[PDB]
Structure formats: structure tokens, C-alpha cells
Design a protein around this ligand. Structure first.
Ligand SMILES: NC(=O)C1=CN([C@@H]2O[C@H](COP(=O)(O)OP(=O)(O)OC[C@H]3O[C@@H](n4cnc5c(N)ncnc54)[C@H](OP(=O)(O)O)[C@@H]3O)[C@@H](O)[C@H]2O)C=CC1
Ligand SMILES: NC(=O)C1=CN([C@@H]2O[C@H](COP(=O)(O)OP(=O)(O)OC[C@H]3O[C@@H](n4cnc5c(N)ncnc54)[C@H](OP(=O)(O)O)[C@@H]3O)[C@@H](O)[C@H]2O)C=CC1
Ligand SMILES: CN(Cc1cnc2nc(N)nc(N)c2n1)c1ccc(C(=O)N[C@@H](CCC(=O)O)C(=O)O)cc1
Ligand SMILES: CN(Cc1cnc2nc(N)nc(N)c2n1)c1ccc(C(=O)N[C@@H](CCC(=O)O)C(=O)O)cc1
Ligand SMILES: Nc1nc(=O)c2c(Cc3ccc(C(=O)Nc4ccccc4C(=O)O)cc3)c[nH]c2[nH]1
Ligand SMILES: Nc1nc(=O)c2c(Cc3ccc(C(=O)Nc4ccccc4C(=O)O)cc3)c[nH]c2[nH]1
Ligand SMILES: O=c1[nH]c(=O)n([C@H]2C[C@H](O)[C@@H](COP(=O)(O)O)O2)cc1F
Ligand SMILES: O=c1[nH]c(=O)n([C@H]2C[C@H](O)[C@@H](COP(=O)(O)O)O2)cc1F
Lengths: 507, 507
């Protein structure tokens, strides 16, 4: 028995694959993907067979594919022995004669329209599925890819790629059937030493809290860098109290890694409020600490830490209603500046870290001191809340890309973390355009990674959703100064998330 | 054809296993390891056979081991059928009849003295070796474990454990003989997209720069967290210039993780100057920036950045010879203090972060703001060198352990990194004793991880050395204040490193 794999490129939601006898898109890299997989063989004196329907055979110009033998399923095509690279069969079952008879065929690929896909799955001929999920859904389709049967399980999901501002993935599905001593030794050592063995302090998450657990070795989509951290906290998190009335499950010392070259790290397993994230970031960039300016733009994330009852509770009753004090955006633009109120004019006072960062990224790109800090011990007592994202470093690669590292001392994985991922991604892209670079990578290093106990049912629901390709984010215009960005300048392309999940903030 | 494994506990350097008819040590957990490994079986109605010499049979009191059959090799013991749990054979080869005849034996273990080990290896009877490396060498031995033949390769090396201040490892050696489509798909995607696929920017290190490459899935010893970072830089490092004349190979965004409960992360692949590391750390704690105080104690690590030629070169010619300026230990003890010279009295000026950190660690252990920073933009111009270890956070676990996270913007993997690993480990243990806790974990997050080009032959030599168990570090007395620590108070137990490697610092 030889292998029979399905190759298909379908839309991410409705699984559309065609329109009016052709594809709904033109993605060059996806065709090169089709070519390399269908040519991938082990024996030199053998070829692969590509099965396709007649309409698909028409759509490719009715011309052969090099180094391969095309098999056309048709009820009315002549079975002429003229073309040795193209053969015609009357039904799909007969065309699977290559298995038993033809020993010159190594592997078999099904890749030819809805009619052939649906019959190849209903008759249980397919061993593996190569799916290319494309992020295009507000268009018209007339040919779809059938629903994948439950007998298949995902084993691979690539990172998100981008062609002509279109996001797409690459997945592999395997059909289900019915080193040995190293794992045993580690288990025995774990029985002897309790939590003395550090592995037992970092236990692998159980399958019941592992997002898409059938993907073991192919967890390439960088949203798994966030989802697996959720799983790691649910497994190893210590129940601990904190300044709020809501206890958490907390571990210490974690990291996440994200790409920004070919996609934008906005979570797809939950609809993330991208507008509020931006309006908070430009609020930091402008140097503003007036909490009213966010409420005037219908952004209330800082209303909890900016009520008169909260400020008098922490010893800042002399402060105005939403005067959050010297915080993010006051240490960015006026570091070590004497803070009075939020209405005063601070032009010239303090150290403008953001300005020095932009000027250093352009004049000395390979400098190792592109640092933006917000942890100022002399001003902590005056802040409405100590900074969570305390320090960030930036890096110019040899191909003119801008990467970013962030250390955040405390991380609300339910609310703050999805914001921190997107917020510092936008900041890096802003810094890249003003400095003339392209976006690079984003790494976030976390101290107290925790989950609030009132987010448990919500985050467990989020872990039940298999991720979708990351969207794209582009700027509509090039700005003179970094302060000039507006919400209308941001174009979010290809974002098809799961429904939003409500989670209450702990004050 | 059953399995024949060797179980042995030998010294780390000389491979001593016995003295005067008994063990050179008493490690309880190692006996539980011997028991669990020799009892590990698959069939309920089968037993394992334990082969041992006569003198070894004497050393265990001539009493049986539960659920197992002991096989004694002796030329003079009576072959009485009285005891069914003990059988005697006249030579080692005859006793390997367990393979052909007794189908009631599942696995075979050789574990009985130098004479049996050497004959079992010279006759090629052993399939696998379970080695427990013990860090005790300045004692007396009379029975040794033979040199492991080249036909064996290590496949596992556990973390370092500790019993009665003795460090030890657990290794597995396999004998050499004569998830398939996922790797193919990822390789094809790497051909289509160049450095567009993030995996190609983080290529797995080649075997020629991978320390002990035969250990694929068992790289548990946390010195591999440092050695693999060296391998990762040699593979992906971009050749970049910097403020010095010595270029580096640099990557961005890396992390290392170390245990501190059962061992001390002092590198064994190179003899690390631990005294200089400590004398620099207490120099930081005391708040001292006078570089002469380190030179007076024969510690010259800061002499390069504190020469009259270097200081005048970077615009500090007004400064005294070794006046390094407000640096580590001046932001620790006197944050935001106006720095004059190194001779002035700074008692009372600035924010004492170290004092507040200790007081916060004791009074509010689960607080999420145990932060010690050294990045002060207002003082960077006055420093002889901006801080490399810029910010650190501390964490109290539910079992009264103190963990530490460090963000390092720039990392000299040849010189600074071995110091940074050990230094912040010592600092965390000092903070743990003054606050009444035990050492926890150490995680180091790195920005610009690089290797200087004049360290290439040296670090490749270091990568050729298989690691040894981490040592132990204990304090001889409980101190009143953290400033009271002295070098004589530190006892380094079980440190048997490889010879030191000379590497020049880039000024
Ligand atoms: N995104 C992707 O990966 C792909 C998309 N497509 C798109 O899908 C569309 C085409 O698919 P689709 O509409 O389903 O047409 P098909 O490609 O499935 O071709 C159908 C033809 O195959 C023959 N056929 C099908 N079933 C049988 C049967 N049971 N017995 C005998 N003959 C059979 C018939 O030929 P006959 O009339 O001669 O009897 C039929 O007309 C196009 O738009 C194409 O571009 C196609 C391939 C891949
Ligand atoms: N750290 C560890 O893992 C272990 C350490 N040890 C230690 O090592 C020491 C003992 O080892 P060791 O000194 O080598 O003594 P052995 O344990 O190897 O026993 C030797 C005896 O086995 C018999 N024997 C050996 N070879 C032959 C042969 N070719 N034909 C017939 N009989 C043979 C002889 O018994 P006879 O004289 O009756 O003929 C010989 O005296 C002890 O200190 C023990 O504690 C032991 C086991 C494990
Ligand atoms: C059958 N078909 C429709 C089509 C389009 N995109 C797809 N995409 C995927 N992922 N899977 C499919 N089955 C698929 N099929 C095809 C098949 C081949 C070519 C084609 O020109 N292939 C060249 C591509 C050459 C190149 O781009 O380098 C080859 O050599 O295979 C176009 C459409
Ligand atoms: C043959 N021998 C010497 C000895 C000591 N340490 C070793 N350590 C290792 N790693 N490997 C060996 N072969 C070894 N052998 C032995 C064998 C068994 C026991 C013993 O008492 N074993 C108990 C373990 C008792 C316990 O768990 O405390 C068992 O149930 O097997 C002591 C010494
Ligand atoms: N404990 C604690 N956690 C914090 O995150 C935090 C912040 C920042 C912040 C970030 C995000 C939110 C928030 O509500 N996000 C949302 C989530 C889902 C759907 C919609 C939204 C939406 O905002 O529309 C609130 C606050 C300041 N102070 C804090 N304290
Ligand atoms: N560029 C750059 N790199 C740095 O590491 C650095 C430091 C800290 C430091 C740390 C270590 C050394 C050093 O020489 N270590 C050794 C290594 C092997 C064997 C012996 C020694 C020994 O000292 O005895 C020098 C300096 C201050 N300023 C710096 N600038
Ligand atoms: O950007 C943010 N990210 C974040 O994770 N938090 C959460 C983390 C923690 O749950 C809470 C309070 O921090 P702490 O209790 O350490 O003072 O703020 C707040 C932000 F503003
Ligand atoms: O504790 C230290 N750790 C460290 O890694 N360096 C190295 C890193 C780098 O090679 C150099 C400073 O880089 P730069 O001056 O360009 O920021 O010092 C120096 C220390 F003092």
C-alpha cells in the first residue's frame, strides 16, 4: 500500500477553493508549495501521480506537469495512449489501480476539485491532508473543500506567511489508526526526588488543558507561544494571594516569541480590542498621563486604577480624579522629571528616552544600548500603579529589521498579555518606519506570569479553539514624527478571530 | 536476545567505585535509583537478573534483593539449590545463559565490581550503561570502573542532585548498532521562503558545534542551557562591529535557565575564577565604585574599563585613574544620587534599592515588585560603562524559596556570561539567608547575545568538553547584614572543572 495525500488550498472559515473555474486568489508561494510536495519522492526511477477532476484539468490549461503523471477523472475524455504524462480514468476507484498494479508509482496525490475531494474522503482513500488555509472570506466562492472527517487529526500548523497582504498557514492532517529507556529513567528520578527535580516544577501540561493536543511536534504557529504559556500556568501555577481580592495561579520566569516580518501577533482565539490597544500606545508616546483623554476616546482600561476611591485608598487623595501620575509616557519622555499634576507643561524637563531611542536607532544601529525603561524608584510612590512592562530593548539586524525584547515583571495572562503582545508590536513597527527599517521579531520575557481565578472558565474556553492565521497590519501613510499616528492610519487585514470572551479586571 | 545493562556509581574524575570492600560514600537516593531501575519490568510473571562478583555479594551482607534474582560469579561458592533467589556461576559467560535458557528472566543487569565490569565490556556483553557520576575525588579508592569503550555514546545527562553536600549526576550510554513528513514539509517551506520563515533565522546548530551531540533528548544538565547558547550563536550569529575593535557574532533574544536548589550553576567545562566573581559581587553590595579596591584584592576584571587612556578616550579624562563612576552598586544603594568622585561619602543620598528589596522580601513575600534596577538614563553619560545586567526581579515561592530573573542587554558569552550566571546565583542565595528562605531558580534573559571573534577557537575548545556535575556552594555562617559576607565564609564543595581557557577582554 502506497501513500495517498490530499493537497488543497482553502479559505480559513468557509473552506472555499474556487470560483468560476479558477482560484479565488493568486499566491505564488502556495504553487511552489504544491510543486515541491508533489515532486518529493525517494526513488529516482519512479514518479508521483496527481489525481484531479476534469474541470481542474481544464483550469490548469490542459497541459502536463513536469516530472509527474497527471491522472484525470472524467466520464467523457478519450483514453488515448498518446500522452504518457496524462492518463484518464472513468471513476476515482479505478484510478487507485496504481497501488496494486503499477510499481513505477511511488506516492499518490489527490488535488482536483470538490467532486474528487468529497469522493476521496467518503470512500476512505486519503491517508494525509496538506491544507493551506488562506485568510480571505468576504469574497465569492462556488467550489468548497469538504469538511475534514473526525478520523483525521492535525499534526502540524506552520507560522503565518504573507503574500500581497494576504495571510496564510500550512497544516498537515494525519488519519488515525488503532528514547524508550530515557523517558523511563527520568520518570524514576522524578519519583525519588519530589519537587527537588526541577522537571517536576515544570511539568508538561496535561492533554485536557493543551490547545490542539494532537499537534505534538509541529507547534509552529506563534500563537502557541501564548496558548502554551496558559497551559503551563494551569498545570504548574501556585495558588497565591496578591494586593487585590482575586487570587491567582502564578509561575515565575517565562518567555514568548513572535514573528513580525510575515504577520502581526494579534490573537485569533479571541477577538482582541485592537483600537483600545493603539489609543493607549499613542497615549504613552505623546507623553500623556491624563487618564481622561482615554475615556474621552471611549477607552476605559485605565478607569479602574483612576477612580477617586482608588487613589485615596493607596494614599493619593490629593490627586485629581484620573491623574494617574508619572507612569508610562512620563518616564518615556520626561524621565526623572519632577511631577506636579497632569495639566502642567513638562516640555524640556526630564530625559526624553523615546527621542534618544529614535535618534540612536538611526545614527548607531548596531549599538547595544537601545533601551527604554519605565522603572524609576524615585517616582514609584507617586504612580497610580507601578509599571508592568518595565524595560524594553531594540535591535537592528544586518538586513535593516527592527526586533524588540520586553521584560514585564507582572503579566495578567487573561487581559494584559494579549494587549502587551500587540502593543509592543505596534510600537516596534512605528519605530521601524520612523527609522527606515522593517519589523523584525518580538520576544517578551515575563516574571510573575499568572491567571486570575475568575478567568479560569474563560481561558479554558479559549484553549478549546484551534488557532487561525495571524492577520496583517499596514500603515496607510508615512508620518513625519512618531507622535502623528492616528487610528485611521492603521489597516488591519485578514483578521478572522473567534468570538470575544468577557473577563473582569482585578482592581 | 534480552537487554544487558550496567548499573554503576563511579567517581567523576578517577571513576572510583569502592574502598576496602565497601562504597566510598553513602548516598541514599542513589540506592533508590538502583532499586527502581533493576525492578523496572514489563511482565508481571517475570524477574530481572542482577549479576555481581563475590566480593560485591559479600559487601551487601550476602542477603537477597526483593523481587529479583541475584547471580553471583565465584570460583569457590557452593552451587546449592537451597536459595531460589541466589544462583552461582563459575564464569561470567556461563551466567549469560539467562538469554537462551531461562525465559523467566526479562532483563539482565551487570552491577558487581571492577572484575565483572571489565569482563562484561571486554567481551561485548553490555548494551547500555547507567552511570551515576559522583563528585568526590580527594579521597581514597581501590576499586574502579573501567573506561567506557568508544562503541558507547551518551544519550542522557540529568540535572545535578545533592545529598549531604555531595553533587551527582545520572547518565545513560547506548551502544551503537550498524514525524517523518513533518520534517520534510518544514524543510520544503524553508526552501520557498528564505529568511522569511522564522525557523531559518533560528537554525538548529550543526553537530560540529553541538556539545556532546549524541545526547539529543536528554540534555537535562542545566550547563547545556549555556553551552547550547554558544552553539546557537556559532550557527546563527551575524558578524557585526561595535564600539571596540573586536567584532562579534550576535543574535537577539535568548534565555538560560538554571537550578539552585540542588546545585550551584558554576560552569564545569572551564575553570571559572569564583573568587573574583564573589569579590565583585560584594563590591556591588557595599555600594563601592572604587576600582582600586578590586585591584588591591588581586581582581583585575574592571581594570580595562578603568584606565587613564580608556577614560580619556570616552570623554572622562577629568576622572581619576580607576573611578568608574555611578555604576552597579551605586544605583543599587544610592539610586538617582548626584555622583561626585569615588572618595566622597554617599551615606544617606539616593534610593537604597537593596535595602528596600530585602525589607520587601521579608514583609511582603508574594509582592510582585521585588525589582532591582541599574538602568538610570540620567547617569549613563557619567558611567565608565553602561550596565549590562540592567534589571533583576525576585520571587518567593509557596515553599519559601527565592527565585531570580535577570535581563541582560549585552552578553559576552566568553567572559561576562559565566560570571553573570554565578554572580546572580550568589546574590540570590545571600538574599535568601538574610530573608530566611532557600535558593530557588535562576533565569537569565539576554538581549544582544554575542561571541567576540577572538574567542572562536577558545569556545570551540570548550564545546569539546562533556560537562560534569555542578558543584555545591554553602555559607559557613549566618550574617547580620548582607554587607558582612567575606570570601572565607564561602565553601565551594565538589568543583572539578576542566582546565581554564584564556580569553582576552575587548576594551
Ligand atoms: N484551491 C485548490 O486547491 C483547488 C481549487 N480548484 C478549483 O475548484 C474548481 C473545480 O472543482 P470542481 O467544480 O469540483 O470540478 P472538478 O475539478 O472536481 O472536476 C469535475 C469533473 O470530474 C469528473 N468527475 C467528477 N466526479 C466524477 C465521477 N464520480 N465519475 C466520473 N467522473 C467524475 C467529471 O468530468 P466529466 O464532466 O468529464 O464527466 C466532472 O465534470 C475550480 O475553480 C478549480 O480552480 C481545483 C483544484 C484545487
Ligand atoms: N559503586 C558501585 O556501583 C559498586 C561498587 N562496588 C565496590 O567494589 C568493590 C568490589 O569490587 P571488586 O574488588 O572488583 O570485587 P568483585 O565484586 O568484582 O568480585 C570479585 C570476585 O568475583 C569472582 N570472579 C571474578 N572474576 C571471575 C572469573 N573470571 N571466574 C570466576 N570467578 C570470578 C571472584 O570470586 P572468587 O574469589 O570466589 O572466585 C572474585 O574474587 C567493593 O568495594 C564494592 O563495594 C561493587 C559494586 C558496585
Ligand atoms: C491543480 N491545480 C490547482 C491548484 C492551485 N493551488 C493549489 N494549492 C494547494 N495548496 N493545493 C492544490 N491542490 C492546489 N491546486 C494546479 C496545479 C498546478 C499548478 C502549477 O502551475 N503548478 C506548477 C507550479 C510551478 C511553480 O510555481 O514553481 C508546478 O510545477 O507544480 C497550478 C494549479
Ligand atoms: C551491589 N551493590 C553495591 C552498589 C551500591 N551503589 C550502587 N549505585 C549504582 N548507581 N549502581 C550500582 N551497581 C551500585 N551498587 C548494592 C546493591 C543493592 C543495595 C541495596 O540495598 N539495594 C536496595 C535499595 C534499598 C533502598 O532503596 O534504600 C534494593 O532494594 O535494591 C546496596 C548495594
Ligand atoms: N490587574 C490588571 N490587569 C490589567 O490588565 C491592567 C491594566 C491594563 C489593561 C489592559 C486590558 C484591559 C481590558 O479590560 N481588556 C479587554 C479584554 C477583553 C475584551 C476587551 C477588553 C477591552 O479593554 O476592551 C484592562 C486593563 C492596567 N491595570 C491593570 N491591572
Ligand atoms: N567587553 C566587556 N566584557 C566583560 O566581560 C566586562 C566586564 C566584566 C568582566 C568579567 C570577567 C572578566 C575576565 O577577564 N574573566 C576571566 C575569564 C576567564 C578566566 C579568568 C578570568 C579572570 O578574570 O580571572 C573581565 C571583565 C566589565 N567590563 C567588561 N567589558
Ligand atoms: O500592561 C499590563 N500588563 C499586565 O499584565 N498588568 C497586570 C499584571 C498584574 O495582574 C496587575 C497588577 O500588577 P501588580 O499586582 O504586580 O502591582 O497588572 C497590567 C498592565 F498594565
Ligand atoms: O557583567 C557584564 N556582562 C557582560 O556580558 N559584559 C560585556 C557584554 C559586552 O561585550 C560588553 C559591553 O557591551 P557594550 O559596551 O557595547 O554595551 O560587556 C560586561 C559586563 F560587565
Amino acid at each position: 500500500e502506497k501513500n495517498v495525500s490530499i493537497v488543497v488550498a482553502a479559505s480559513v472559515l468557509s473552506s472555499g477553493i474556487g470560483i468560476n473555474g479558477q482560484l479565488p486568489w493568486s499566491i505564488s508561494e502556495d504553487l511552489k508549495f504544491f510543486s515541491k510536495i508533489t515532486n518529493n519522492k525517494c526513488d529516482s526511477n519512479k514518479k508521483n501521480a496527481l489525481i484531479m477532476g476534469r474541470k481542474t484539468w481544464d483550469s490548469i490549461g490542459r497541459r502536463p506537469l513536469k516530472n509527474r503523471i497527471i491522472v484525470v477523472i472524467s466520464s467523457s475524455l478519450p483514453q488515448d495512449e498518446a500522452d504518457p504524462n496524462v492518463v484518464v480514468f472513468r471513476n476515482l476507484e479505478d484510478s487507485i489501480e496504481n497501488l496494486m498494479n503499477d510499481d513505477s508509482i511511488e506516492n499518490i496525490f489527490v488535488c482536483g476539485g470538490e467532486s474528487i475531494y468529497r469522493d476521496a474522503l467518503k470512500d476512505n482513500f486519503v491517508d494525509r491532508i496538506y491544507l493551506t488555509r488562506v485568510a480571505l472570506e468576504d469574497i465569492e466562492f462556488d467550489t468548497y473543500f469538504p469538511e475534514i472527517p473526525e478520523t483525521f487529526l492535525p499534526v502540524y500548523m506552520s507560522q503565518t506567511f504573507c503574500t500581497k497582504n494576504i495571510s496564510y498557514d500550512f497544516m498537515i492532517f494525519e488519519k488515525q489508526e488503532k528514547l524508550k529507556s530515557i523517558d523511563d529513567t527520568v520518570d524514576l528520578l522524578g519519583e525519588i526526588f519530589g519537587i527537588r527535580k526541577m522537571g517536576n516544577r515544570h511539568k508538561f501540561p496535561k492533554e485536557e488543558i493543551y490547545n490542539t493536543p494532537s499537534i505534538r511536534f509541529g507547534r509552529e504557529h506563534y500563537e502557541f507561544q501564548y496558548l502554551d504559556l496558559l497551559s503551563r500556568v494551569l498545570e504548574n501555577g501556585a495558588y497565591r494571594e496578591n494586593r487585590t481580592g482575586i487570587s491567582t495561579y502564578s509561575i515565575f520566569g517565562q518567555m514568548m516569541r513572535f514573528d513580525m516580518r510575515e504577520s502581526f501577533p494579534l490573537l485569533t482565539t479571541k477577538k482582541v480590542a485592537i483600537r483600545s490597544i493603539f489609543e493607549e500606545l499613542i497615549w504613552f508616546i505623546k507623553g500623556d498621563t491624563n487618564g481622561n483623554h482615554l475615556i474621552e476616546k471611549k477607552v476605559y482600561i485605565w478607569s479602574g486604577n483612576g477612580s477617586k476611591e482608588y487613589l485615596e485608598r493607596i494614599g493619593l487623595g490629593h490627586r485629581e480624579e484620573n491623574d494617574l501620575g508619572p507612569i508610562y509616557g512620563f518616564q518615556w519622555r520626561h524621565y526623572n522629571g519632577e511631577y506636579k499634576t497632569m495639566h502642567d507643561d513638562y516640555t524640556g524637563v526630564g530625559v526624553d528616552q523615546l527621542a534618544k531611542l529614535i535618534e540612536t536607532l538611526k545614527n548607531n544601529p548596531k549599538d547595544r544600548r537601545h533601551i527604554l525603561t519605565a522603572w524609576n524608584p524615585s517616582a514609584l510612590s507617586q504612580m497610580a500603579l507601578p509599571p508592568c512592562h518595565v524595560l524594553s530593548q531594540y535591535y537592528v539586524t544586518n538586513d535593516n529589521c527592527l526586533s524588540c525584547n520586553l521584560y514585564q515583571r507582572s503579566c495578567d495572562l487573561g487581559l494584559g498579555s494579549p494587549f502587551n503582545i500587540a502593543s509592543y508590536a505596534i510600537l516596534t513597527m512605528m519605530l521601524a518606519q520612523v527609522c527606515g527599517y522593517e519589523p523584525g521579531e518580538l520576544a517578551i520575557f515575563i516574571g510573575d506570569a499568572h491567571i486570575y481565578e475568575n478567568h479560569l472558565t474563560q481561558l479554558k474556553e479559549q484553549l478549546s479553539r484551534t488557532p487561525r492565521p495571524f492577520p496583517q497590519l499596514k500603515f496607510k501613510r508615512k508620518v513625519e514624527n512618531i507622535e502623528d499616528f492616528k487610528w485611521e492610519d492603521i489597516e488591519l487585514i485578514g483578521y478572522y478571530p473567534y468570538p470575544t470572551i468577557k473577563m473582569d479586571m482585578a482592581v
